[PDB]
């Protein structure tokens, strides 16, 4: 139930300035990433994943391929989580949040540069208004920095007495999003925050986990007129940069993912703030996906191999001859 995909972004100008060369070749059809490792010429390691998106990949492609099937499961009343993992500067935030094309050329709903979070919020309204039923949508956004919780929309964690796998975050702002106009407003506010953030703030962010949670309450009425409510939650997690001190939440999440994939009887959720928060959306019926982001440039060989080695172990798929 854990999908692992790789997304490689295009070369950037910093990498061209450094005179780096391309060491990554992506093959979306074979689902492979091959990396030149010798600096050598023939030295090469190949990894196989569930999906591989190369540099030309559009935001809408990632959304349709990765998120849509997961959203469908959330709408059935399950809790699911999608992660972006990788070195700082490789595309975690672009993938999760994306951005607005310059000059207001598009609405957020239609913008080709919008990422997973804005697309998910728009699709929830689409999918459920055309479904015909009554529903509400709430969002929260929290940051985990140095094993402490911060509310990005405005904290203390306690186990939830009415949910053996869940926690209650005291004081966390959960805002109702009533329509698509309110979606636009939250996105405009977030972009303003990103755009005007000082350098120290961006830096903090590169070392922090961001957890955007959308909770959907869906009402049905049995034939005789009884009201029933089901709840689905989708956590969209932009992880701290993976480059090498040790991030306790990231190491703990890795261990949790390993325990889940290997069917280790003890899954160490309690060992970190992040994994306690995500416990109720990990390990169960639920679809989980990890999007591992990488750079194609030679400058980043060590960090790219680190990411690929981890992601490969998390899925372990044998290369097809
Ligand atoms: C560098 O420090 C930052 C860390 C997280 C950030 N992410 C945020 N902050 C947000 C604030 C508000 C608000 O005030 O209502 C709303 C959304 C925020 N986001 C997330 C965000 C930011 C830009 C674009 C899209 C998104 C979103 F909502 F995740 F899709 C922004 C930063 F500037
Ligand atoms: C800067 O500090 C860190 C950098 C990378 C990290 N990445 C890790 N550490 C992992 C440990 C284990 C284990 O011992 O079982 C397994 C995976 C680990 N990863 C990779 C990781 C971690 C969290 C979420 C996804 C992933 C993965 F596999 F890369 F997709 C963890 C850090 F704490
Ligand atoms: N696939 C991509 N195509 C074009 N630009 C990208 C892509 N991925 C990331 N970028 C850009 O590269 C820069 C760093 O990406 P960002 O998502 O902030 O990385 P991270 O969160 O991993 O540090 C940003 O300006 C972002 O828009
Ligand atoms: Mg980022």
Swiss-Prot record:
Residues 1-317 form the Kinesin motor domain. A subset of this protein primarily localized at the spindle pole is phosphorylated by NEK6 during mitosis; phosphorylation is required for mitotic function. It is found in: Cytoplasm; Cytoplasm, Cytoskeleton, Spindle pole. ATP binds at residues 86-93. The modification N6-acetyllysine is found at residue 127. It comes from the Eukaryota. Belongs to the TRAFAC class myosin-kinesin ATPase superfamily. Kinesin family. BimC subfamily. It is linked to Microcephaly with or without chorioretinopathy, lymphedema, or impaired intellectual development: An autosomal dominant disorder that involves an overlapping but variable spectrum of central nervous system and ocular developmental anomalies. Microcephaly ranges from mild to severe and is often associated with mild to moderate developmental delay and a characteristic facial phenotype with upslanting palpebral fissures, broad nose with rounded tip, long philtrum with thin upper lip, prominent chin, and prominent ears. This is Kinesin-like protein KIF11. It comes from Homo sapiens (Human). The chain holds residues 18 to 363 of 1056 of the full protein.
């Amino acid at each position: 139930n854990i999908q692992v995909v790789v997304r490689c972004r295009p070369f950037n100008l910093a990498e061209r300035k450094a005179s780096a060369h391309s060491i990554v070749e992506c093959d979306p059809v074979r689902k492979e990433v091959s990396v030149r490792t010798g600096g050598d010429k023939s030295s090469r390691k190949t990894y196989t994943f569930d999906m591989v998106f190369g540099a030309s990949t559009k935001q809408i492609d990632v959304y349709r391929s990765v998120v849509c099937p997961i959203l469908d499961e959330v709408i059935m009343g399950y809790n699911c989580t999608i992660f972006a993992y990788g070195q700082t500067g490789t595309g975690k935030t672009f993938t999760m949040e994306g951005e607005r094309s310059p000059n207001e050329e598009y609405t957020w709903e239609e913008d080709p540069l919008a990422g997973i979070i804005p697309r998910t919020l728009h699709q929830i309204f689409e999918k459920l208004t055309d479904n015909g039923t009554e529903f509400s949508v709430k969002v929260s956004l929290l940051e985990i920095y140095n094993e402490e919780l911060f509310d990005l929309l405005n904290l203390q964690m306690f186990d939830d007495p009415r949910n053996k796998r869940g926690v209650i975050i005291k004081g966390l702002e959960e805002i109702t999003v009533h329509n698509k106009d309110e979606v636009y407003q939250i996105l405009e506010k977030g972009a303003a925050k990103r755009t005007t953030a000082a350098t120290l703030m961006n830096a903090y962010s590169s070392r922090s986990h961001s957890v955007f949670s959308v909770t959907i309450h869906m009402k049905e009425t049995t034939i005789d007129g009884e009201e029933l409510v089901k709840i689905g939650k989708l956590n969209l997690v932009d992880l701290a940069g993976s480059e090498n001190n040790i991030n306790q939440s990231l190491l703990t999440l890795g261990r949790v993912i390993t325990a889940l994939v290997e069917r280790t009887p003890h899954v160490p959720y309690r060992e970190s703030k992040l994994t306690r928060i995500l416990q109720d959306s990990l390990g169960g019926r639920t679809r989980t996906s990890i999007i591992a982001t990488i750079s194609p440039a030679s400058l980043n060989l060590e960090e790219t191999l680190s990411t690929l080695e981890y992601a490969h172990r998390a899925k372990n798929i044998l290369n097809k001859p």
